[PDB]
Amino acid sequence: SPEIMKNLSNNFGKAMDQCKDELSLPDSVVADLYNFWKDDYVMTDRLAGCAINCLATKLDVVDPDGNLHHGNAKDFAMKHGADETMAQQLVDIIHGCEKSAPPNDDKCMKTIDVAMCFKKEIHKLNWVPNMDLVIGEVLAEV
């Protein structure tokens, strides 16, 4: 019974259930975000990026005292759990993403681009499966 079966108050269980409605997307793909498929960005399932975006639906739950703000994480989020390097580092990709991810009305798929861009920085936590058998073709160590 992983995170898939472990849901917080509502900030998630609600956003997830709501996302499964508003976005009518599979709450499973979004439930994977909690797993560790971060590497798997919209590139595969944008819904996961949209659902997560809707996750902020209520910042009151996400941030009681203003822990952060979807799209624009306060200096608290990217600090209380950010690497001294990630501080500026992110400013690197975020500079290439945020620049490519304007405040388009499709923020759902726009802002997310960034909300996920940085997420990629995590995908390279300690393990970097730069090459992981996906289709089982000549590319990754099958």
Curated annotation (Swiss-Prot):
Keywords: Disulfide bond, Pheromone response, Pheromone-binding, Signal, Transport. InterPro entries: Odorant/phero-bd_Lep, PBP/GOBP, PBP_GOBP_sf. Gene3D superfamilies: Pheromone/general odorant binding protein domain. It comes from the Eukaryota. One of its GO terms (molecular function) is pheromone binding. The keyword Lipid metabolism does not apply. Coiled coil: none annotated. Pfam families: PBP_GOBP. Disulfide bonds join 19-54, 50-108, 97-117. GO terms for biological process: response to pheromone. CDD domains: PBP_GOBP (cd23992). Antenna. Belongs to the PBP/GOBP family. This major soluble protein in olfactory sensilla of male moths might serve to solubilize the extremely hydrophobic pheromone molecules and to transport pheromone through the aqueous lymph to receptors located on olfactory cilia. Homodimer. This is Pheromone-binding protein.
